[PDB]
Ligand binder design. Structure first.
Ligand SMILES: N[C@@H](Cc1ccccc1)C(=O)O
Ligand SMILES: N[C@@H](Cc1ccccc1)C(=O)O
Ligand SMILES: [Cl-]
Ligand SMILES: [Cl-]
Ligand SMILES: [Cl-]
Ligand SMILES: [Cl-]
Lengths: 246, 244
């Protein structure tokens, strides 16, 4: 069957990833967290349009994207919204909404690094333990399928912060990120970093839902309507069209 | 519940649209089909083990008409350059995306159009804007240009669109970018695309709502993406440029 989400409480899993989901520690005299970003704005549009009660739950620190999907499949959340890549392995265990965004990956490196693209990584110009890969992500899947043939011979990373510190501290030479956030970091957060080469792994982001979900149609119709009316485009411009770096 | 498509017969609706689904007449007449869509069917059939009963939609069937026919049970799935839209999703489901999409404005070379704003500002008499009925282009026009008014020059087939542009009966039309690039680079060398692309969207395989086999088809589509087969197919069918 199918039904409307009007009146329904949804526990919505979100995962820290600037500027999709931005976590601010604030004291207001008690310490609390404030969430903002593209994802929280999207949640507000959907809530206002669909009438569900949003119960937004931030995934614990160092939760992987795979861990978030597994947690939903196990019943810890009703839906999960973020920069979450739709993959065949995930689709085996959860469903996804219509796409909220196209996606691809790029190679991130320190400026001045003598790398010109993916060919250098595939030909072994960089030792493999100096390629940083965020575990439990689509980038790990790609690496294992296309670069290393199954072997996790990369340098593992648990958060964007560890990627930052490792690259800057010269522990790794490159890493992989989704293009939207990769552009964002190199343009606003770490000006010493840059993107190199062509993008790869063309893909999409989707809202994660349970398989065979009662509310699949209601969510999909609404997401498509936001796509059609330019709301998703506006949110992308709002949160991603910025460059603080000189 | 859910299940696998192995050994199951699927009636697969396809719709003429070069070079997704290419229709040739051969002779005692018979029809041959080739294209991106037919190759995709073969890859999915080989991976999934279903039995494919491929059925071409009657001439001048619109895209809305194909979707409606599937909702009415004439087909089990429909595969083509079929735009995923909110209105269609009310009555059918869609597989994971097989491709990104957008639209562009199609015109004769030499026509002085900057882009969509000219159309929105009334630079072009509305009966000289050709719109293929029962397509996402009509939906866009009604929503963004004419305020719900069907005041365009209605087109029933891709051929009527070309004929009308070439004969000077209309000044512009809308087409999906993949097929638009194909026709302007290979078939009608005196036509061209102009302006920014608009109506960013996706193509998806049409399935019944709440379909038993939804996961099986989706996992398999995503697998074809991941392993580069969809890219290979796009390269095969769309990278040609015969026009000088
Ligand atoms: N989109 C990736 C997660 C990711 C986000 C940002 C940077 C790198 C990886 C996934 O779903 O696995
Ligand atoms: N993709 C359009 C149909 C179309 C195909 C090719 C060119 C123009 C329009 C739809 O689904 O409505
Ligand atoms: Cl989609
Ligand atoms: Cl499912
Ligand atoms: Cl998708
Ligand atoms: Cl449905």
């Amino acid at each position: 069957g199918s039904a409307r989400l009007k009146g329904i409480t949804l526990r919505i899993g979100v995962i820290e990833s600037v500027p999709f989901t931005i976590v601010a520690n604030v004291i207001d005299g008690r310490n609390t967290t404030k969430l903002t970003g593209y994802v929280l704005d999207l949640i507000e549009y959907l809530r206002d349009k669909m009438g569900f009660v949003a119960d937004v739950q931030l995934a614990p620190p160092n939760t992987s994207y795979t861990g978030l999907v597994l947690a939903l499949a196990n019943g810890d959340y009703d839906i999960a919204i973020g920069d979450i890549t739709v993959t065949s392995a995930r689709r085996e265990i959860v469903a996804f909404s219509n796409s909220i965004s196209d996606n691809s990956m790029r190679i991130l490196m320190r400026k001045g690094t003598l790398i010109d693209g993916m060919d250098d990584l595939k030909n072994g110009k960089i030792p493999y333990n100096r390629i940083g890969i965020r575990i439990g992500t689509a980038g790990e899947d790609y690496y294992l399928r296309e670069i290393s043939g199954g072997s996790r011979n990369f340098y593992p990373l648990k958060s964007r912060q560890e990627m930052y510190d490792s690259l800057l501290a010269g522990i790794i030479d490159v890493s992989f990120m989704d293009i939207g956030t990769a552009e964002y970091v190199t343009n606003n957060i770490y000006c010493n970093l840059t993107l190199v080469g062509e993008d790869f792994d063309k893909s999409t982001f989707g809202i994660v839902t349970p398989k065979e979900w009662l509310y699949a149609k209601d969510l999909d119709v609404n997401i498509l309507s936001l796509r059609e009316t330019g709301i998703l485009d506006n949110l992308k411009k709002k949160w991603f069209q910025t460059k603080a770096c000189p």
